[PDB]
Design a protein around this ligand. Structure first.
Ligand SMILES: Cn1c(=O)c2[nH]cnc2n(C)c1=O
Ligand SMILES: Cn1c(=O)c2[nH]cnc2n(C)c1=O
Ligand SMILES: Cn1c(=O)c2[nH]cnc2n(C)c1=O
Ligand SMILES: Cn1c(=O)c2[nH]cnc2n(C)c1=O
Lengths: 114, 114
């Protein structure tokens, strides 16, 4: 059920999303900008292992289209994106190191929800 | 709607929970074992800042009582527990360092969901 706080909480989510896409974090956010192109990257098992792909451009489209009804729905998609990275790649992969840094940005600001 | 995979996914969640409570992680998991006793700790603003407290003993009770209907519901509570820590405490607090380590244990194993 919609709560009167949902629009303002979704604005905070949109602010987080803008930050995740901003130049400040680009050195470690770039793998998450667009859907994994598994074939182009030679990751021919990606879609067998990752049944629910997610990336920031998809989160952005869903925000713009008002798909997310509350902050929790938005956060679940962002976390799914990171979990897919942790599931698919070995834990010492540089993309995992980047995911952990970007997820720290996300989690600490999401925790500051007004 | 319940899916036939939900019992086995909740068993994986229960395994994660058991690991989070195990001696292997006790050096950094202990702050999360029981509800924050705000008055006893002198944290007299805790319940003004944290509107939804969560801790591992509460997650355990909810698992034992079949409160969680799927893995996503379980994960949201575990993540709420960590987010409360990130919200309430300064980011250099030792309890935050412990939360980040325990959350890494959680996220990497949750990502290995069968
Ligand atoms: C360093 N780096 C890369 O190595 C890379 N590869 C693809 N986009 C990239 N971007 C945006 C980037 O900043
Ligand atoms: C998200 N992601 C991955 O998980 C990954 N694994 C290997 N290359 C990868 N690339 C380029 C990527 O963007
Ligand atoms: C080190 N340490 C502590 O400092 C502590 N304080 C309360 N429980 C505690 N436990 C279980 C612990 O291991
Ligand atoms: C979870 N948590 C906290 O967030 C915290 N902040 C200060 N002491 C704290 N303690 C003992 C604690 O258990």
């Amino acid at each position: 059920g919609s709560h009167m706080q949902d629009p303002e909480q979704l604005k905070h989510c949109n602010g987080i999303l803008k930050e995740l896409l901003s130049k400040k974090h680009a050195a470690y956010a770039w793998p998450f900008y667009k859907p994994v192109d598994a074939s182009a990257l030679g990751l021919h098992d990606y879609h067998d292992i990752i049944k629910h792909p997610m990336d920031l451009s998809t989160v952005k489209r869903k925000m713009e289209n008002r798909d997310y009804r509350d902050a929790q729905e938005f956060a679940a998609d962002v976390r799914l994106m990171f979990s897919n990275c942790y599931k698919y790649n070995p834990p010492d992969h540089d993309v995992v190191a980047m995911a952990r840094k970007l997820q720290d940005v996300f989690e600490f600001r999401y925790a500051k929800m007004p």
